[PDB]
Design a binder for this molecule. Structure first.
Ligand code: HEM
Ligand code: CL
Ligand code: CL
Ligand code: CL
Ligand code: ZN
Ligand code: ZN
Length: 196
């Protein structure tokens, strides 16, 4: 009944708020690591004398720089979702008291905030998927230049890129969980209105 559904909706929102925090914190860890890996790449690229290696490392570096902008956009998208979550909280606490009374604008605002957060999480997801694909492409490029012996510095770059992919995967994993929570928030909140 409604008591149990209000409890579930409350619990889902608390979980969502924690997950959003963990996402943002991971983005900041991803920024740090990307910045650190770019330092190593720029040095390696500059020091490279083999044409093949130099050209590959320049393409990786070019695109890693672009990752910094994409990650900043991802973090701005997560912050916006946090701002909307605040508003869901305040409007939801008012809906707890008012219910369906008065005109529909409060109800609609809360539904519209939820729709907007779902759209932000889809954007965030897509931007993260774009970064992770390209990070994987840079693994494949590094492997092209890692034939034979030596390549010690290249192996260090590869190891860092592999740690990056681990983190990006975790980022997408949390985003998918967050999107699932938002679906459950929608379903439970719809049930709350249906039960009146
Ligand atoms: C991202 C999606 C959503 C989030 C984070 C969210 C969050 C919240 C929060 C924090 C509350 C106040 C809980 C409390 O009383 O302490 C609330 C209340 C409520 N929400 Fe949502 N909500 C979401 C989507 C929806 C949708 C789509 C609907 C309806 C279509 C809905 C209907 C309600 C209703 C009826 C209440 C009042 C009952 C209550 O306070 O427990 N919510 N929501
Ligand atoms: Cl260079
Ligand atoms: Cl070289
Ligand atoms: Cl590439
Ligand atoms: Zn990257
Ligand atoms: Zn690339």
């Amino acid at each position: 009944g409604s008591p149990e559904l209000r409890q579930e909706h409350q619990q889902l929102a608390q979980e969502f708020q924690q997950l959003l925090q963990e996402i943002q914190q991971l983005g900041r860890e991803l920024l740090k690591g990307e910045l650190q890996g770019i330092k190593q790449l720029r040095e390696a690229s500059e020091k490279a004398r083999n044409p093949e290696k130099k050209s590959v490392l320049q393409k990786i570096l070019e695109d890693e720089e672009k990752h910094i902008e994409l990650l900043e956009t991802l973090q701005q998208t997560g912050q916006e979702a946090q701002q909307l979550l605040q508003e869901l909280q305040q409007t939801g606490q008012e809906l707890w008291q008012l219910g369906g009374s008065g005109g529909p604008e409060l109800r609609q605002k809360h539904q519209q905030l939820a729709q907007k957060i779902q759209q932000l999480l889809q954007k965030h997801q897509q931007l993260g998927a774009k970064i992770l694909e390209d990070e994987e492409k840079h693994i494949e490029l590094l492997e092209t230049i890692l034939g034979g012996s030596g390549g010690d510095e290249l192996r260090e770059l590869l190891k860092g890129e592999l740690q990056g992919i681990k983190q990006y995967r975790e980022l997408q994993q949390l985003g998918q969980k967050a999107q699932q929570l938002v679906q459950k928030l929608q379903q439970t909140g719809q049930k709350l209105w249906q039960l009146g």
